[PDB]
């Protein structure tokens, strides 16, 4: 499949209460594989996956110093923005960045990108053509004009088309086994009619990974996806997730109701009724 | 590896 390498960055100011908290988290095919947290005991770029340990400390030196550079720069950026937006010197604010490359199974680059947000709203972004920027508002327009004059995008292209891709197809080797793995769920229905006449039926899936799963209810043939109740997929802890779906039915009719559980770990979908 | 961010 198409893999990606993405870095998520947060800088969040906390006036009076210390120094801007800084964070870089890295994902490969969308699982956390490195982190830096200005707030940890002895800040440093720690591996977040066992397979990253197979990396020599010369690598943990560079990344760490980079982050301290970056951290210090976002310190300054948080300040710049106060003057662009005319905001007051003592409120809290947030800058976030997403950067990465997306690579085909054939290894060719599909999409390089980099997007910035201030206080949860898109601020500036690099366009698909990898040469120009789209600014979301009047402050980002300053940033953008500034970045054009400095040819900042050619530097970004180079990183996105070179380093990023080359380091992607390298974390992929050392991380594969752990990454393109998977684990099947296990279900069970449950009756939870609080001493009443109506009978709501609930389907429980657990133990599964990845979080891609789908559960449904049908009236044997036709689909009862109308009044079906289900909550967002949650993570359990060990590196696997859980989910449940539910729906109302006339008491007496209970075994005319089937649950369906789909997941790539399974060799066939799962089916179950009351136990 | 990550990137070295330009200033805003």
């Amino acid at each position, epitope marked *: 499949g198409p893999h990606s390498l993405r870095y998520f960055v947060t800088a969040v100011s906390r006036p009076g209460l210390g120094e801007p908290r800084y964070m870089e988290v890295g994902y490969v095919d969308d699982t956390e594989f490195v982190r830096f947290d200005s707030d940890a005991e002895n800040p440093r770029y720690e591996p977040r996956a066992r397979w990253m340990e197979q990396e020599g400390p010369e690598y943990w030196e560079r990344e760490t110093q980079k982050a*301290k550079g970056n951290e210090q720069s976002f310190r300054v950026d948080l300040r710049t923005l106060l003057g662009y937006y005319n905001q007051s010197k003592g409120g809290s604010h947030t800058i976030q960045v997403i950067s990465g490359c997306e690579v085909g199974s054939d290894g060719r680059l599909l999409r390089g990108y980099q997007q910035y947000a201030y206080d949860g709203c898109d601020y500036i972004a690099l366009n698909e053509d990898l040469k120009t920027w789209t600014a979301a508002d009047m402050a980002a327009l300053i940033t953008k004009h500034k970045w054009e004059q400095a040819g900042e995008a050619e530097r970004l292209r180079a*990183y996105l088309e070179g380093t990023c891709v080359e380091w992607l197809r390298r974390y992929l080797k050392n991380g594969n086994a752990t990454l393109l793995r998977t684990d099947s769920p296990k279900a069970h229905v449950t009756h939870h009619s609080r001493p009443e006449d109506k009978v709501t039926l609930r389907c429980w899936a657990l133990g599964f990974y990845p979080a891609d799963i789908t559960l449904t209810w049908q009236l044997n043939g036709e689909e009862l996806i109308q009044d079906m109740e289900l909550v967002e997929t949650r993570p359990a802890g060990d590196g696997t997730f859980q989910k449940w779906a539910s729906v109302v039915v006339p008491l007496g009719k209970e075994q005319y109701y089937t649950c369906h559980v789909y997941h790539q770990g399974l060799p066939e979908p799962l089916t179950l009724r009351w136990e | 590896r990550g990137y070295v961010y330009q200033g805003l």
Partner: T-cell receptor
Amino acid sequence: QKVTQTQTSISVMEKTTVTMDCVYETQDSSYFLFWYKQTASGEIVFLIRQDSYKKENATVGHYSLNFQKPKSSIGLIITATQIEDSAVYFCAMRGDYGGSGNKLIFGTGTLLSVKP
Amino acid sequence: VTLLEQNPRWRLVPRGQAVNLRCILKNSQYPWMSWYQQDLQKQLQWLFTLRSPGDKEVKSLPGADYLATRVTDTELRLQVANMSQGRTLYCTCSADRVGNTLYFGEGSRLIVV
């Protein structure tokens, strides 16, 4: 060393063309190389720069670079040397990213004498 | 039409006497300000880069002890203590911290006398 200027001095005639060597080391993916010159009164004037990811020898006025990535080398060519071209020439490079801030790393510099 | 103004321009001073230096930014599109030292054989070496007002810092080099303050968005200061040999101090400015060109002030020349 990180930035190296092997030659101490050069003496040449007016109207000649001089090359100043510089060789460098860095483990950065992207980097930037500069030449500055310093005059008798000690002012340090910027001359020309070369970005590593840019695939063409920079040039400005009679100053031009001979940029040779594989050889970690970045010569400064002055064509048609003038008397006022006489100074010390500094080769510099941006000193690897990390807390530090605005770090230029300099070589020891080269004296250029242009004889009338 | 220069970006930076540096004072004082020189100083004659016995071994060890403290000296203060100050640099004023004239163009605020280059707010990244650094101090560089050139020693008596002309070797330039970086000392500090101070972006924000209130940024304070110390750095001991062979022959001198430094303390630097970004005082306001245009004023940068330098304390040189314990100076045992002369050297000259250059203020610089640049438009950002990655890759932009550094431009040099005229230097404050220190002479142990």
